[PDB]
């Protein structure tokens, strides 16, 4: 994208302010729970202030940074998309379960992933994407070998690089993969998004097979769903203990959140630790907690 100048940053802030105003409408009845757009935008403004703050004078450098240019372009693009959603959606923005409203929720999640990425690349406001720490050793090696110290690469470029190590079966699978990894929905793949994907779907040795079994063919996987949406979705299965679904945790990016109906009538969500999703799901099945993916009687057999 074009170079980032103070003016552009000002424009984004103004667009964010408008999104905030629109989302304060009492008719929305937005719950103050992550992801909460009313927190996310102001927090994004604050971190952008910090960044500019630490680039006093040396602004030219900041403006030329590729990641920052892509980020600001996407921020402006997403904020406008949200404003458009409101005007084009009109009164339907308040009818829960309407597409326009669901779109606002997905955007809220995207703003959340964008803020997390920004802080992960600009911790303390200083660019550090070139030294970012990829969590899984194998994934780390793949990235430096193919992209060196780059912080962000176009999807096409990422797809081709991955393909050489983990063959992608088809165009449709490639599109599914993209939608899973492209957390900021900007057609680019940052080292940050790459880290999240590879941690969620480790081990790297069977990366795509893992992803296929846990998300492509698994009825329990919920792409871009929030905590509240998971709880809402499990309500119809309140009388069917063992019904469960899972998704990316929004506040613990890189970890899973599994929602399930208990025998005593509660709908809980837990974040597995010290065990990849694979083992969490298998143990949960055996213990009788994760039996019916999205309420379906048949549960995928991952013990293979």
């Amino acid at each position: 994208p074009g170079t980032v100048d103070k003016k552009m940053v000002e424009k984004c802030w103004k667009l964010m302010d408008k999104v905030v105003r629109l989302c304060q409408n009492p008719k929305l009845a937005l719950k103050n729970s992550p992801p909460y757009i009313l927190d996310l935008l102001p927090d994004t403004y604050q971190h952008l202030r910090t960044i500019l703050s630490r680039y006093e004078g040396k602004m030219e450098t900041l403006g030329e940074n590729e990641y920052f240019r892509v980020f600001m372009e996407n921020l402006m693009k997403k904020t406008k998309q949200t404003i458009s959603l409101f005007k084009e959606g009109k009164e339907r923005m308040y009818e829960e379960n309407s597409q326009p409203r669901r779109n606002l929720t997905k955007l809220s999640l995207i703003f959340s992933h964008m803020l997390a990425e920004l802080k992960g690349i600009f911790p303390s406001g200083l660019f550090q994407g070139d030294t970012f720490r990829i969590t899984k050793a194998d994934a780390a090696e793949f990235w430096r070998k193919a992209f060196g110290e780059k912080t962000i690469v176009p999807w096409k470029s990422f797809r081709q690089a991955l393909h050489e190590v983990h063959p992608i079966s088809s165009g449709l699978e490639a599109m599914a993969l993209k939608s899973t990894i492209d957390l900021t929905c900007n057609d680019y793949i940052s080292v940050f998004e790459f880290d999240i994907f590879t941690r969620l779907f480790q081990p790297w040795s069977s990366l795509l097979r893992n992803w296929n079994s846990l998300a492509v063919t698994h009825p329990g996987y919920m792409a871009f769903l929030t905590y509240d949406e998971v709880k809402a979705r499990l309500q119809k299965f309140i009388h069917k203990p063992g019904s469960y679904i899972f998704r990316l945790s929004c506040t613990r990016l890189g970890q899973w959140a599994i929602g399930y109906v208990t025998a005593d009538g509660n709908i809980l969500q837990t974040i597995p630790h010290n065990k990849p999703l694979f083992q969490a799901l298998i143990d949960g099945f055996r213990e009788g907690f994760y039996l019916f993916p999205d309420g379906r009687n048949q549960n995928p057999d991952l013990t293979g």
Binding site: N32, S33, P34, D39, Y227, T251, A257, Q269, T270, I271
Partner: peptide
């Protein structure tokens, strides 16, 4: 301000 979601364990 947002209140963290209730996770369990």
């Amino acid at each position: 301000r947002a209140v963290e979601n209730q996770y369990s364990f």
